[PDB]
């Protein structure tokens, strides 16, 4: 998992640039409580 | 106007960047009086 800084805005259509990263340890204890999936159409069962 | 080469001036804004803290708190969307 890298850290990237020329981002695409999600607020609108644009790009933003942020400050360089921070001093030390970054902790991100989280919960994955979801997914977002898509599919593939076709074809003539199949998987 | 005009008409397919619509003038897409990609503007740019420069603001100051203080390094901010960020941790989202819960939010309760209430409905007003009468709803």
């Amino acid at each position: 998992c890298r850290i990237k800084q020329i981002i695409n805005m999600w607020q609108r259509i644009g790009q933003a640039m942020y400050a360089p990263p921070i001093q030390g340890v970054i902790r991100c204890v989280s919960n994955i409580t979801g997914l977002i999936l898509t599919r593939d159409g076709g074809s003539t069962s199949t998987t | 106007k005009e008409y397919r080469l619509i003038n897409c001036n990609t503007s740019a804004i420069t603001q100051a960047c203080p390094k901010v803290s960020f941790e989202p708190i819960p939010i309760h969307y209430c409905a007003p009086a009468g709803f």
Partner: antibody, heavy 127, light 107 residues
Framework: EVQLVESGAEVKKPGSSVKVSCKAS????????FTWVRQAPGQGLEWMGR????????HYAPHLQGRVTITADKSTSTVYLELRNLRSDDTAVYFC?????????????????????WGQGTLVTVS | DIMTQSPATLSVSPGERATLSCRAS??????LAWYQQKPGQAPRLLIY???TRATGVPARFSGSGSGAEFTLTISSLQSEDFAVYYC???????????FGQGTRLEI
């Protein structure tokens, strides 16, 4: 590590518009933020401006408001400067200078202010 | 708005340790760039970030300091360390990265 071949020296006039190029041949052109810095003869360096290549945004010193334009082209790999309203003090040695900013194509942009790679200096004479 | 150098002229002899320092009006504490310019040459970088050497920098160039005042030291002053030394403050955003004045070292 681009080599920054500057333009030739020119003879200019008071109240003119000079156009100085800087061919940065070498590594990836969009990964390099560039900077124009002038040098009065015998004096110290004066910072003129800095262009970010991949965002295509250029910032300027407060003394050069409305009279300088830093452009760049990514196919020609060339950083152009255009001065309008040339005055008597504008006879000076100009410098284009770049620095490695990281993988700007996807991620990293370190926003460095120091100038690692330099050009060669070009004297513009206002006569 | 800000950038003076703490000496003005250092007309010293080789072997003598040099005295180079940079004075700033407001606190920076991480962003000072050191440059060396012989007359007729593009200014070679020495120390960026006021704490580290670039590529091809000899070990005799030792930069240090914090806040607004910084100091570059050259212990073994050679027969090539006579030039003009610049310090560049690159703290602030939006970019107004002013330079120092310069210190000449004619022997």
């Amino acid at each position: 590590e681009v080599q920054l071949v500057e333009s030739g020296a020119e003879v200019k006039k008071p109240g003119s518009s000079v156009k100085v190029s800087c061919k940065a041949s070498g590594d990836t052109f969009i990964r390099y933020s560039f900077t124009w810095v002038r040098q009065a003869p015998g004096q110290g360096l004066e910072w003129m401006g800095r262009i970010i290549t991949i965002l295509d945004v250029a910032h300027y010193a407060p003394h050069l408001q409305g009279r300088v334009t830093i452009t760049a082209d990514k196919s020609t790999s060339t950083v152009y400067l255009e001065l309008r309203n040339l005055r008597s003090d504008d006879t000076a040695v100009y410098f284009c200078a770049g620095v490695y900013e990281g993988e700007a194509d996807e991620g990293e942009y370190d926003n460095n202010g120091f100038l690692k790679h330099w050009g060669q200096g070009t004297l513009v004479t206002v006569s | 708005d800000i950038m003076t150098q703490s000496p003005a002229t250092l007309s010293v002899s080789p072997g003598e340790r040099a005295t180079l320092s940079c004075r700033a009006s407001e606190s920076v504490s991480s962003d000072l760039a050191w440059y060396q310019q012989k007359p007729g040459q593009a200014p070679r970088l020495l120390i960026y970030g006021a704490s580290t050497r670039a590529t091809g920098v000899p070990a005799r160039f030792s930069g240090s300091g914090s806040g607004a005042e910084f100091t570059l030291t050259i212990s073994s002053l050679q027969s090539e360390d006579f030039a003009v030394y610049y310090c560049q403050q690159y703290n602030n955003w939006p970019p107004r990265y002013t330079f120092g004045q310069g210190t000449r070292l004619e022997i």
